[model samples]
Target: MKHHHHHHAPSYRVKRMDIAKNDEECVVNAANPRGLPGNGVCKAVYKKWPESFKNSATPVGTAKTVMCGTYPVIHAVGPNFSNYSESEGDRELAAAYREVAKEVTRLGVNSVAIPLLSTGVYSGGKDRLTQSLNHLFTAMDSTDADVVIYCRDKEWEKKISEAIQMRT
Candidate 1:
């Protein structure tokens, strides 16, 4: 007897690219809790055209707001990296990622770019980081937008690819 294999393709393709130079509507930083405009992807994008994007800081679990720029900036909160743990922390961060995804979709943009949330100096482990991203991608499927996750380094690019492949 022969068995058939059914491979379901992903609804969306998650590709790795550099958002700092892309001409998209918005670029998302896996930002610091404060969401201040400074170093990292946030600053890189802002440096290109500061006057174009409005920067605002807000705590997680609030309604979304839009910052206007040559490319608008939408800052949504994810889990606080400081409070993350291998066991319980993953779940919390996953929740935060879901919230951010929801808000990103709510903002009425067709294309949204992101970086690995809390996986850098913030130090979320691969497991937790993957979990957080899984939550975000699940939400992405429901929205009428294209989601692109940009990584500034090779390690992060590999990590993000693995995480997204697992979901696909």
Candidate 2:
């Protein structure tokens, strides 16, 4: 996938990698409340330059504003591992992500990278997570931001691809 330099541009591409090699101002991830980057795709990328990345606030469910990083790292919140099976929990997590996405767009970020929220250590399975993401994507008027979902695993990539393609 190509790297994005400007904000508000859409790049409908997903790749399996932990860190983004492209020289964007920031890097995004599906992180936990403790700000620990996961063992998923972002691991390698984050490991390569650990100091460059800052973890978003923990348990992002309660956040209202878009948290910015020293660089351009825009942290997107996902479900916590503690409640991965609860539909209500997943919905709430999805709401947090949606709020963050909206704020990111409002901030005039041209390109933002994201991970599959609630699909991993978080709550909800693929179907639930996909539905939540679809809701956020559909609701977001990212006319000025390129919302990119970065999948680190093949299963996740496939599932997200199918979900996005099948989305009405």
Per model, how many backbone clashes are there?
Answer: 2, 12
Stretches > 4 Å off in candidate 2:
1-11, 22-25, 41-49, 52-55, 62-70, 124-129, 139-143, 165-168
How far in Å is the alpha carbon of 90 misplaced in model 2? 2.2
Q: Against the correct fold, how does model 2 do in TM-score? A: 0.66
Question: How would you encode candidate 2's per-residue C-alpha lDDT over 95-137 as one tens digit per residue?
Answer: 7666666656555656566665666655433355556567557
Clashing pairs in 1: 52-69, 53-69
Model 1 local distance difference test score: 0.57
- For model 2 the local lDDT of residue 62 reads 33
In angstroms, how far off is 25's CA in candidate 2? 4.6
Q: Which 10-residue span in candidate 2 carries the lowest summed lDDT?
A: 62-71
lDDT per prediction?
0.57, 0.56
- State TM-scores per candidate: 0.68, 0.66
Candidate 1, run of 10 with poorest lDDT: 1-10
lDDT of 1 by residue, 24-53 (tens): 567665444465655666677557645534
